[PDB]
Design a protein around this ligand. Structure first.
Ligand code: DGD
Ligand code: CLA
Ligand code: CLA
Ligand code: PL9
Ligand code: LMG
Ligand code: LMG
Ligand code: LMG
Ligand code: LMG
Ligand code: LHG
Ligand code: LHG
Ligand code: BCR
Ligand code: OEX
Ligand code: FE2
Lengths: 28, 75, 66, 37, 334, 38, 30, 42, 341, 34, 35, 52, 42, 38, 30
């Protein structure tokens, strides 16, 4: 079943974008 | 099953209305709780330089490189 | 189709053509050799790379006997 | 027997189970998903 | 019946060997004069004051060069943007000293290439073709006019124009890097993607046709002789190459339409070189690429280096060394 | 000797592929000459 | 003496361009 | 000062392979004139 | 029947993504080269190897982020996670620069596994394998730059880091130190890349401009069913066009599309031969007849000797910050400046 | 059943809230040279 | 040098006038459709 | 004298007689066919196929 | 000290006329194989 | 063009006359080399 | 460097003597 094919690529991608939005608000 | 028939269905958006915010916030909390600086060893903005070490840290050994990075990351 | 005296000697070496062992044969014996030769190449590369240190084996220019 | 040699054979065992758990899972699922003649 | 109608019938005849057309009335006299002056100026031409400091730079073969180092040198810094023909030079020796033939070649080149482009339109009109091959040729015409015409305009001198040579090209590219930072500019980025993508889809389309050829030859003769010229049968199984690429990546990423496929081969490079040639144009007027030097700082405020700071120290090496005598004042305004 | 070989074939080169191969050699001669003369 | 070879390579290249355009094998249907 | 073995490199790098490709064309046209049977086959 | 036949029939089954035998080498190794790059450009720094910042945690954008090469003290170690350098620790493995070899090695077995994918699908569909042979072009650029170039050099440090601006310094590092543009193997490679982009822009614009009328609509994209045997563009017209514009033209669709394969791929093979010659520092640096003359005659200037003075600026100014391991402390008075710059 | 253009609208403006958030932090926070 | 200059303006506006009066010579009607 | 603000670069009076005899020598060729035609004959096309 | 234009005299005095005489033989055998009509004419 | 020329002929060189002409060139190359190198 | 040309002319002459003796066009009656 193809739920292992997409979500090996999409479950990381949303997790890293949760971090890239947090790094916009980090300052010195 | 066709792909466009999936995302237009309601049952799709029932499941992924919980999983996406529960996974995006976990990517937020992975950073804001200061966890990512310790897994990957990335310096915080406080700790590029230290009080003692004022130069650029470099690894200068083949085999004791793990021990030398134990030196340059304590202070 | 010219019989020569050297051709008569070597003729049983070429007389077989396309006889096979029926089935899978000695293929699982071969793969155990190929798995072994894969491990052999990994080891002697990592000795050479100094990423696998063996006691009393130093990869450096050594005093060959003169 | 060294630190480097003992860690390498452990990686060779670990390289066997990575091929292993992929292979063992692949044989079992290939039984269930066989094609009708 | 008239003499003009018997001349218009010949000059627009497709029955000529090479179609001349009305653009060939100013393509052929322009490009043969750009050619016949280039061959002489590349082989036998005395050295040229390019920096305007009376230090003549040799560029021709008779003065000790080769194919690589020899180049038609751009005109002087003393002239700059002024029009400098032969009759406004008081001798040919004064013309060849100050960078004469660079303006004669370039101005007859850009007229002849902009007429070679309109000539590709004209024959498409007289042959019944849909017209737009000449729009695809606008992309190197945009790029030729960017380094020979537009960049000397915004920098105010033909001496900053591109030297007609091979080593002169790399003198042009490196000095353009230090002064404008082209690699960080997103329009050189959009045309590296145009020619890496262009050479991809070239060799990706050319392989899937050659993969799916139909048996029409024997194994002794050539593969190419299974195409007779002007035949009406299709020479490759296009369903076969669609099912291959439909499994090589996935199904929905494959063009089954061969017309939309052969349009995407014309879109991607040409749009990539239109955008790139308007990178040189907007950097002709000193709107440079990105500058991320000293962008990452710690909480103390000390500058933390990045890859752009290492790239900056390569730009500072070329900036302090280009035209090592021409400068007198601390900032290269030109 | 022995008999005639049944694997005799003929070699072809049309006028098109002549000009490719000539221009291939001269352009490689233009390119690599400057380095060989050094 | 050295540049004489470079000139012969250049005009020799322009010869085979001339023969390829005008003496081309003209393709014919049937 | 140039290397005097480069004249032999270039002028044989031109002529020897380029005279080779001429030969494959002349015998190609001779086989076509050979089969054709008229005025040139002999 | 047997156990091998059930596994062979399962992998080759029609499904969403074709797995095949080669997917066991591609899909594990390509997933970890790509994910190793996204992690290394986001989280892992270059503060200890190069003395830079190359992460998104450290303020770098998409352009100035990279997965960076390890230190020169590591030499050409493979930097295994269990190795003598990292010794099982993940955190010290990332700081030495272990992800870079993780990306490059699992990436090199992705390009092996992807080229085997193109032999396997061509055998099942039943076509000639020219995609797998044209893809050997990009294999010869990955291997001879990301692998064979740092092997000939001092360590993995002189390799391209996997980041956008980190490639850009590698372009500038290769001009000042190697004079890469003078090399005839790049010159035959630019002729294939700009020549390959040329051929698809022409063949794109000539097919689309000799189309037949197959419909009454003004949109010509609609008038093509894929399984039709009639050709969709007039080859006789397109030959007659370019024979009068350019003078010479293709009269062979089989030769044309093969020529669109040969030109881009050969530019990747000829340029790959030269970069192997720069692992050994066998560079085309100087024309000695130009250099002996410019030494004896202090008036003879070409464009070629102008490029050497541009390379002294690259060799002196960046090499202080390029190589912090070697500790170049240049005075201000040795750095070649021009007049008043 | 949801109309597909509503799905591409909400996800499409969601990307704009992600992209313009990234161009925001080029001028603030880390990597802003403030 | 004022003798060459005369020769150029002859040659330019010879071919420019062939260009200008070429497209005024009913040039849209010269197509393979009709006439 | 380069940077003089003179019309079409006409420095001397002799260059005018070059310009006038260039446009007119081809104009007179053009009027031999397209001149002396009816200036009062229209069409409701996009393009006219009138005569030679 | 020898004359460095003599290498070009000899090695082109060998190769250019000797490669000429090879060509007249190859097209001779191609015409004979051209008329003969068997396995090699094409 | 015009019509095909009826004066087309064929050129011949048998295997005998090849070895004459090869040996003619090499022996003239042996003889005259020593003088050209001087 | 000079004598290398003389040797190549001599053994090159002895090649075409070898091919003329053994690969000769054998004359045949009828
Ligand atoms: C084609 C399709 C390919 C498909 C892609 C496949 C990708 C697979 C990936 C290949 C893995 C190769 C990396 C192996 C690591 C490496 O190389 O590691 C390099 C080591 C050599 O180690 C180096 O060895 C050097 C030699 O040192 C020796 O000499 C020094 C002075 O003499 C000192 O004495 C020192 O003590 C002594 O050890 C230095 O020590 C370096 O610091 C040390 O790193 O060799 C080794 O592991 C093995 C080297 C021997 C094998 C040679 C083949 C590989 C190398 C090809 C390149 C040759 C170079 C040509 C350039 C072009
Ligand atoms: C770059 C990729 C590549 C590709 C696409 C091919 C393609 C092909 N090879 Mg070939 N080959 C290659 C590289 C490649 N080769 C290399 C580098 C070698 C070793 C010199 C070989 C040796 C080889 C032999 C001996 C034979 C083929 C054959 C074939 C054909 C059949 C398919 C096959 O068995 O593949 C070969 C299979 C692979 C390349 C899979 C490799 C997977 C490896 C084993 C994983 C191991 C990784 C390792 C554990 C990691 C540690 C290393 C680290 C320390 C660096 C096909 C044309 C056969 C043939 O001729 O067919 C007619 C054949 O007999 N190949
Ligand atoms: C007109 C300008 C021009 C042009 C056209 C070229 C052309 C070229 N240069 Mg050159 N160069 C130039 C100017 C130019 N140069 C100048 C001015 C400099 C400065 C001195 C250089 C310096 C330079 C260097 C230093 C190098 C080149 C190289 C090359 C070659 C490109 C290699 C290539 O195709 O990479 C394409 C990339 C690949 C083939 C890698 C494989 C791609 C993989 C398969 C992609 C996989 C991605 C996958 C889908 C996953 C992605 C998803 C993930 C991101 C999530 C090509 C011949 C390189 C070369 O010669 O290499 C042989 C090289 O090393 N050039
Ligand atoms: C269970 C456990 C253990 C837990 C761990 C979880 C786990 C299992 C994780 C593993 C999951 C994992 C990572 C698997 C995912 C697999 C995966 C996708 C990995 C690969 C990684 C990766 C980075 C892939 C992305 C890269 C990719 C392949 C991109 C494709 C690029 C793309 C879409 C290109 C299209 C370009 C294009 C439009 C080409 C057509 C144009 C062209 C001229 C083609 C030529 C052409 C086309 C035709 O069409 C036809 C007709 C003809 C004639 C023709 O000429
Ligand atoms: C048919 C074509 C026949 C011509 C072949 C054309 C090849 C031309 C290129 C080779 C000649 C260029 C050499 C420079 C000329 C010169 O004078 O050199 C002259 C030098 C000899 O050098 C002379 O030596 C003398 C004493 O030996 C004196 O010292 C002289 O001073 C010195 O100049 O000759 C060579 O270097 C010949 C080398 C040829 C062998 C090449 C080795 C490298 C090959 C690597 C293969 C890699 C290929 C990978 C695929 C790509
Ligand atoms: C469903 C499945 C979906 C599959 C997902 C597949 C994974 C592949 C995705 C690849 C994305 C790689 C791009 C990384 C960009 C990144 O995150 O930047 C994220 C960075 C982070 O932004 C930086 O954040 C820092 C925080 O300290 C600082 O604040 C910097 O100032 C700020 O710029 O943003 C940028 O650099 C801004 C510009 C972003 C430009 C990205 C587009 C560039 C073109 C690349 C296109 C790739 C195409 C992907 C197609 C898919
Ligand atoms: C869109 C792209 C941009 C378009 C170009 C923009 C217009 C640029 C401005 C044009 C200026 C026009 C002013 C008159 C010309 C001028 O004075 O030049 C005259 C200048 C002046 O010439 C110099 O003047 C000097 C005086 O300072 C000296 O006297 C010199 O001796 C004299 O040569 O000479 C040239 O630039 C000659 C141009 C020759 C180009 C002719 C080719 C045109 C063919 C196109 C086909 C015709 C169809 C278009 C017509 C409809
Ligand atoms: C096809 C074959 C192509 C090769 C042709 C082979 C011919 C070889 C013989 C000519 C070359 C030998 C010249 C010596 C080489 C050398 O280095 O010289 C080199 C000299 C040039 O001399 C060089 O000149 C330079 C500046 O000019 C420098 O001064 C050098 O120091 C000086 O050596 O070249 C010649 O002398 C070439 C002369 C060729 C013309 C022959 C004139 C005599 C012809 C008389 C015809 C009578 C024939 C009657 C019939 C019998
Ligand atoms: C930024 C992203 C880049 C542009 C995004 C969209 C791509 C262009 C799509 C429309 C193309 C227009 C279109 O699709 O035309 C396709 C056209 C054939 O189209 P048809 O005649 O079928 O119909 C087009 C018109 O006639 C109206 O139907 O193909 C060409 O002639 C190719 C030859 C020119 C090859 C170069 C083309 C480059 C032009 C692109 C510049 C366009 C910018 C304007 C966009 C409307
Ligand atoms: C004023 C404008 C008038 C037009 C100007 C004429 C210039 C045209 C150049 C002629 C190309 C001749 C090359 C012969 C090539 C040849 O004769 O090929 C002939 C070939 C015809 O192939 P066919 O389809 O006849 O072949 C079918 C089979 O028989 C294949 O063998 O045409 C092409 O494929 C050429 C297309 C690429 C054209 C390559 C051009 C590359 C540019 C030139 C690079 C050299 C420049 C060096 C300067 C230093
Ligand atoms: C490293 C490592 C690892 C891991 C691996 C993995 C698992 C990974 C994965 C990862 C991944 C796989 C990642 C991903 C990422 C992604 C991202 C982060 C993306 C982003 C995106 C973006 C940002 C884009 C943008 C856009 C959009 C959205 C739309 C429009 C267009 C554009 C393009 C602009 C392990 C464990 C083995 C261990 C060893 C090491
Ligand atoms: O002229 Mn040619 O390069 Ca454009 O920047 Mn300013 O000016 Mn000169 O210096 Mn830098
Ligand atoms: Fe095509």
């Amino acid at each position: 079943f193809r739920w292992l094919a997409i979500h090996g690529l999409a479950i990381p991608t949303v997790f890293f974008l949760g971090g890239i939005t947090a790094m916009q608000f980090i300052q010195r | 099953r066709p792909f466009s028939d999936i995302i237009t269905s309601v049952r799709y958006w029932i499941i992924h209305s919980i999983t996406i915010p529960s996974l995006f916030v976990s990517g937020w909390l992975f950073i804001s709780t200061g966890l990512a600086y310790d897994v990957f060893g990335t310096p915080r903005p406080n700790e590029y330089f230290t009080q003692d070490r004022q130069q650029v840290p470099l690894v200068n050994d083949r085999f004791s490189a793990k021990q030398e990075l134990e030196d340059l990351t304590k202070g | 189709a010219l019989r020569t005296r050297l051709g008569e000697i070597l003729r049983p070496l070429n007389a077989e053509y396309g006889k096979v062992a029926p089935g899978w044969g000695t293929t699982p014996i071969m793969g155990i050799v190929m798995l072994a030769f894969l491990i052999f190449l990994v080891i002697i590369l990592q000795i050479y790379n100094s990423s696998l240190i063996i006691e009393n084996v130093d990869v450096d220019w050594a005093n060959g006997i003169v | 027997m060294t630190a480097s040699l003992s860690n390498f054979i452990a990686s060779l065992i670990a390289g066997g189970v990575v091929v292993g758990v992929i292979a063992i899972a692949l044989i079992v699922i290939s039984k269930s998903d066989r094609i009708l003649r | 019946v008239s003499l003009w109608e018997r001349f218009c019938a010949w000059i627009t005849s497709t029955e000529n060997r090479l179609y001349i057309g009305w653009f060939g009335c100013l393509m052929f006299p322009t490009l043969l004069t750009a050619t016949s002056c280039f061959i002489i100026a590349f082989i036998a031409a005395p050295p040229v004051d390019i920096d305007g400091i009376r230090e003549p730079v040799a560029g021709s073969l008779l003065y000790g060069n080769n194919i690589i180092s020899g180049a038609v040198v751009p005109s002087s810094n003393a002239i700059g943007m002024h029009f400098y023909p032969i009759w406004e030079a008081a001798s040919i020796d004064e013309w060849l000293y100050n960078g004469g033939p660079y303006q004669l070649i370039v101005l007859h080149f850009l007229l002849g290439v902009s007429a070679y482009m309109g000539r590709e339109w004209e024959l498409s009109y007289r042959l019944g073709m849909r017209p737009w091959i000449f729009v695809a040729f606008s992309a190197p015409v945009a790029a030729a006019s960017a380094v020979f015409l537009v960049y000397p305009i915004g920098q105010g001198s033909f001496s900053d124009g591109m030297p007609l040579g091979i080593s002169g090209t790399f003198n042009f590219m490196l000095v353009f890097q230090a002064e404008h930072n082209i690699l960080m500019h997103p329009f050189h980025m959009a045309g590296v993607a145009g020619v890496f993508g262009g050479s991809l889809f070239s060799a990706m389309h050319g392989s899937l046709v050659t993969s799916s050829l139909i048996r029409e030859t024997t194994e002794n003769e050539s593969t190419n002789y299974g195409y007779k010229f002007g035949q009406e049968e299709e020479t490759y199984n296009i369903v076969a190459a669609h099912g291959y690429f439909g499994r090589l990546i996935f199904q929905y990423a494959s063009f089954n339409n061969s017309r939309a496929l052969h349009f995407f081969l014309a879109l991607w490079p040409v749009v990539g070189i239109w955008i790139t040639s308007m990178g040189i144009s907007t950097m002709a007027f000193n709107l440079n690429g990105f500058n991320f030097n000293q962008s990452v700082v710690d909480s103390q405020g000390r500058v933390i280096n990045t890859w752009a700071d290492i790239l900056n120290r390569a730009n500072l090496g070329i900036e302090v060394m280009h035209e090592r005598n021409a400068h007198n004042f601390p900032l290269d305004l030109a | 000797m022995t008999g005639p070989n049944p694997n005799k074939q003929a070699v072809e080169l049309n006028r098109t592929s002549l000009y490719w191969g000539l221009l291939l050699i001269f352009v490689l001669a233009v390119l690599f000459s400057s380095y060989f003369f050094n | 003496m050295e540049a004489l070879v470079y000139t012969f390579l250049l005009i020799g290249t322009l010869m085979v361009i001339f023969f390829a355009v005008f003496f081309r094998e003209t393709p014919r249907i049937l | 000062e140039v290397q005097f073995g480069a004249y032999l490199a270039v002028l044989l790098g031109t002529f020897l392979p380029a005279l080779f490709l001429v030969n494959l064309f002349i015998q190609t046209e001779a086989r076509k004139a050979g089969k054709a049977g008229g005025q040139d086959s002999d | 029947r047997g156990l091998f036949d059930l596994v062979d029939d399962w992998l080759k089954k029609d499904r969403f993504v074709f797995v095949g035998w080669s997917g066991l080498l591609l899909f594990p190794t390509a997933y970890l080269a790509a994910g190793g790059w996204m992690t290394g450009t986001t989280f892992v720094t270059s503060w200890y190897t190069h003395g830079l910042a190359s992460s998104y945690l450290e303020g770098c954008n998409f352009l100035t982020a990279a997965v960076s090469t390890p230190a020169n003290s590591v030499g050409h170690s493979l930097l295994l996670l269990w190795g003598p350098e990292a010794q099982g620790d993940f955190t010290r493995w990332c700081q030495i620069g272990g992800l870079w070899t993780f990306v490059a090695l699992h990436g090199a077995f992705g390009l092996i596994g992807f080229c085997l994918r193109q032999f396997e699908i061509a055998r099942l569909v039943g076509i000639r394998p020219y995609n797998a042979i044209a893809f050997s072009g990009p294999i010869a650029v990955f291997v001879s730059v990301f692998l064979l170039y740092p092997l000939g050099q001092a360590s993995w440090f002189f390799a391209p880091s996997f980041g956008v601006a980190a490639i850009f310094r590698f372009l500038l590092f290769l001009q000042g130190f190697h004079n890469w543009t003078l090399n005839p193997f790049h010159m035959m490679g630019v002729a294939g890349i700009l020549g390959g982009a040329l051929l698809c822009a022409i063949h794109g614009a000539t097919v689309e401009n000799t189309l037949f009328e197959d419909g009454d609509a003004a949109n010509t994209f609609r008038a093509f069913t894929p399984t039709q045997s009639e050709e969709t563009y007039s080859m006789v017209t397109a030959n007659r066009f370019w024979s009068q514009i350019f003078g010479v033209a293709f009269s062979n669709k089989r030769w044309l599309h093969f020529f669109m394969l040969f030109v881009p791929v050969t530019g990747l093979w000829t340029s790959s031969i030269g970069i192997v010659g720069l692992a050994l520092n066998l560079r085309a640096y100087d024309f000695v007849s130009q250099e002996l003359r410019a030494a004896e005659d202090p008036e003879f200037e070409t464009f070629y000797t102008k490029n050497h003075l541009l390379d002294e600026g690259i060799r002196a100014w960046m090499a202080a910050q390029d190589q912090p391991h070697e500790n170049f402390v240049f005075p201000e008075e040795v750095l070649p400046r021009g007049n008043a710059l | 059943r949801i109309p597909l253009w509503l799905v591409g609208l909400v996800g499409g403006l969601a990307v704009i809230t992600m992209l313009s958030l990234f161009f925001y932090g080029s001028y603030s926070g880390l990597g802003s040279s403030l | 040098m004022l003798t060459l200059k005369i020769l150029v303006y002859t040659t330019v506006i010879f071919f420019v006038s062939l260009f200008i009066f070429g497209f005024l010579s009913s040039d849209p009607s010269r197509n393979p459709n009709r006439k | 004298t380069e940077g003089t603000n003179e019309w079409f670069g006409v420095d001397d009076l002799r260059l005018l007689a070059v310009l006038f005899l260039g446009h007119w020598a081809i104009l007179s060729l053009w009027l031999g066919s397209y001149g002396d035609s009816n200036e009062d004959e229209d069409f409701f096309g996009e393009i006219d196929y009138s005569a030679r």
